[PDB]
Amino acid sequence: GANKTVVVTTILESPYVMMKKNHEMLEGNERYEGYCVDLAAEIAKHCGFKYKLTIVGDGKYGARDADTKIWNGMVGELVYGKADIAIAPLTITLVREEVIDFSKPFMSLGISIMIKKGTPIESAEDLSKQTEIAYGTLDSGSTKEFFRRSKIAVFDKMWTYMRSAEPSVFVRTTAEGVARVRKSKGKYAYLLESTMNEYIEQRKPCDTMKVGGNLDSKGYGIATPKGSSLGNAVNLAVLKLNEQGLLDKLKNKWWYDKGECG
Ligand SMILES: CN1N=C(C(=O)O)[C@@H]2[C@@H](C(=O)O)NC[C@@H]21
Numbered sequence: 001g002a003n004k005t006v007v008v009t010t011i012l013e014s015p016y017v018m019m020k021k022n023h024e025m026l027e028g029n030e031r032y033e034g035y036c037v038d039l040a041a042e043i044a045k046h047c048g049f050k051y052k053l054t055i056v057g058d059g060k061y062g063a064r065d066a067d068t069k070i071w072n073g074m075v076g077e078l079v080y081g082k083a084d085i086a087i088a089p090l091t092i093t094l095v096r097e098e099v100i101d102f103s104k105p106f107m108s109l110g111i112s113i114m115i116k117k118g119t120p121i122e123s124a125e126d127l128s129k130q131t132e133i134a135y136g137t138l139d140s141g142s143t144k145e146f147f148r149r150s151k152i153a154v155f156d157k158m159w160t161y162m163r164s165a166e167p168s169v170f171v172r173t174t175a176e177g178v179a180r181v182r183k184s185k186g187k188y189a190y191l192l193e194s195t196m197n198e199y200i201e202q203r204k205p206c207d208t209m210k211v212g213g214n215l216d217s218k219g220y221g222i223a224t225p226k227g228s229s230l231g232n233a234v235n236l237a238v239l240k241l242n243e244q245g246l247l248d249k250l251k252n253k254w255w256y257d258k259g260e261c262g
């Protein structure tokens with residue numbers, strides 16, 4: 001049939017998608033800025049479609065409720081037909097791959113440790129061998145699942161602690177995790193994706209630090225409904241954009257050009 005505007009679902013997560021300061025005076029796609037806003041424009045240009053950015057209605061990434069079997073978040077919007085494509089820091093995972101299609105990754109990352117500056121922790125092993133400093137993950141996401149599945153002694157010790165810790169060590173959003181690090185006087189460490197950690201480290205108040213290496217290696221992908229015809233072109237566009245340097249240009253624009261910490 002005739003071409004229609006492609007509905008893009010995305011999520012407010014810095015520096016991927018943010019409201020422009022003057023969004024009250026703006027309409028449509030111009031309300032938003034960030035890495036994924038720029039990426040959406042490039043994908044649409046390289047696939048020849050017009051598009052409308054929308055913020056996921058429930059504010060969530062995408063997980064399946066164990067009792068109802070209903071998918072929430074951006075994944076749900078694709079699964080149930082409410083959006084045509086998701087362009088966001090959505091981690092490529094086994095369970096999501098079963099219900100949606102993912103492009104090859106547009107960004108590489110791994111699980112990492114965030115501390116308040118001066119916290120006496122250098123590694124995951126350090127965290128696992130002590131109790132004074134609490135530590136946790138985003139409550140629904142791929143980081144939590146890495147710990148749930150690990151056979152590595154240190155990480156399994158960490159999961160056994162986190163899953164039963166009181167009060168809960170799990171947080172609702174990145175912003176909550178960061179705030180908890182900043183306000184807990186060194187007594188909370190946050191396990192999160194290296195991409196967010198590295199962004200936050202270069203934002204005022206310049207009071208956090210990434211410690212140690214990454215624990216794994218994964219990727220973010222552009223997602224489409226399973227079997228969608230848009231999937232093939234989007235996948236080729238991601239590879240083409242990487243090969244020409246555009247993805248790294250956008251990463252440097254949104255991470256290090258805008259660093260506030262010297
Ligand atoms: C904010 N992000 N942190 C995550 C984590 O699990 O650390 C989630 C992960 C996912 O797609 O589940 N990538 C987006 C979310």
Ligand SMILES: [Cl-]
Nearest residue numbers: 151152153154
């Ligand atoms: Cl081991």
